[PDB]
Amino acid sequence: SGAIYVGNYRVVNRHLATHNDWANLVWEDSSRDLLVSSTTAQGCDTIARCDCQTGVYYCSSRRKHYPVSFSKPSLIFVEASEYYPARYQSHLMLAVGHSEPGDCGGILRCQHGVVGIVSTGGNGLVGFADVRDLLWLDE
């Protein structure tokens, strides 16, 4: 679990969005596993606007942060799960690192701010949904 709170927006994994997220929907994209909903309180986070490929993410299954080198946002095949059919997920960045079910929502940050959130995982792999292109989160 986990969310980014920026301005009057909350960014979550689309597959973990609550009834309240859908009732306050701003934007969602099943191909990116992202959903953004509106909030009344002002957020705590700031978003990176950069091309970093290294950073640090939070891994809830280890209660720890780990450094990572990750690929640029791209279209990557993701196997079927209870949440989605087998499909290509866009704007996904892969890295070598620990991940297990329950780790989605963990934040990836670089020196400039929040880069994205954990969205997928494999055997020694972790995938992050990028949010750096969503320029409207800031205004």
Ligand X SMILES: NC(=O)[C@H]1CCCN(C(=O)Cc2cc3c(cc2Br)OCO3)C1
Q: Does 125 bind Zn ion (CB under 5 A)?
A: no
C-alpha 129/C-alpha 120 separation (Å) is 8
Total of residues contacting ligand X (CB under 6 A)? 16
Task: Check if the beta carbon of residue 90 is closer than 8 Å to that of residue 31.
Answer: yes
Residue 112 counted as an annotated binding residue: yes
47: its two tokens? 């978003």
54 phi and psi angles, rounded to 5 deg:
-135, 155
Of 58, 36, 39, which is closest to residue 109 (Cα–Cα)? 58
Per partner kind, with CB cut-offs from 5 to 8 A, the member of ligand X, Zn ion, none near residue 15 is ligand X
Q: Does 15 bind ligand X (CB under 6 A)?
A: yes
| DSSP-H helix ranges across the chain | 19-23
Residue 110 counted as an annotated binding residue: yes
Of 23, 9, 13, which is closest to residue 89 (Cα–Cα)? 13
Residue 59 counted as an annotated binding residue: no
Binding residues for Zn(2+): 50, 52, 110, 112
Active site residues: 15, 33, 104
Binding residues: 50, 52, 110, 112
Instruction: Please give the residue ranges that form the binding site for ligand X (CB under 6 A).
Output: 15, 33, 78, 81, 83-84, 89, 99-101, 103-104, 119-122
Instruction: Please give the residue ranges that form the binding site for Zn ion (CB under 5 A).
Output: 48, 50, 52, 110, 112
